[PDB]
């Protein structure tokens, strides 16, 4: 979500690189993988789908190179352009959700809550 003023324009590249190579440090490298070129305008927001591309049938929820998912990165395709009397700086908000093909298995206890004696 672009939360800038209406007079602010811009084009952004947002990408996903499936695992196995160098995590992208440059737009040039990020270009090469799955990507969306977002153009800022009346439609305030842009969705990038990270497509299920994997070797195993199910990945793990903890960290592990064997079942790793890859890299997400973003770059300016051009730049943010404002006019005068306009704030030159603004916020972008990001949102995540699962598509309808998504499933989970082997119920377990979370590390995200605990208790002391």
């Amino acid at each position: 979500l672009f939360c800038g003023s209406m007079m602010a324009t811009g084009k952004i590249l947002v990408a996903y690189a499936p695992p196995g190579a160098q995590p992208p440090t440059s737009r040039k490298e990020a270009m090469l993988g799955t990507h969306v070129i977002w153009d800022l305008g009346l439609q305030s927001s842009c969705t990038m789908v990270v497509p299920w591309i994997s070797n195993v049938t199910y990945r793990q929820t903890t960290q592990d190179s064997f079942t790793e998912g890859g890299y997400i990165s973003m770059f300016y395709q051009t730049r943010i352009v404002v006019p005068l009397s306009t704030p030159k700086s603004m916020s972008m908000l990001g949102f995540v959700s699962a598509c309808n093909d998504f499933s989970v298995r082997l119920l377990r206890d979370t590390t995200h809550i605990s208790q002391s004696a």
Binding site: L42, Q43, S44, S45, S97
Partner: protein
């Protein structure tokens, strides 16, 4: 009064629908085990609570 249904077979032995039988022994339904044949529903009430629900290919704000 025996209840019979199909198991969803995962790892199949080298031998097709396999069934299991269930019988309730108690009058009070609270005493029953869980059937676990649970139907699902749309995310919609939560993912799109909109009065005018729009098609994903058309402009969100028109």
């Amino acid at each position: 009064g025996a209840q019979v249904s199909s198991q969803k077979v995962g790892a199949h032995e080298n031998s097709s629908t396999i069934n299991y039988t269930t019988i309730n022994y108690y009058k009070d339904s609270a005493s029953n085990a869980a059937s676990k044949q649970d139907y699902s529903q749309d995310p919609s009430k939560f993912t799109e609570p909109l009065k005018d629900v729009l098609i994903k290919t058309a402009p969100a704000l028109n």
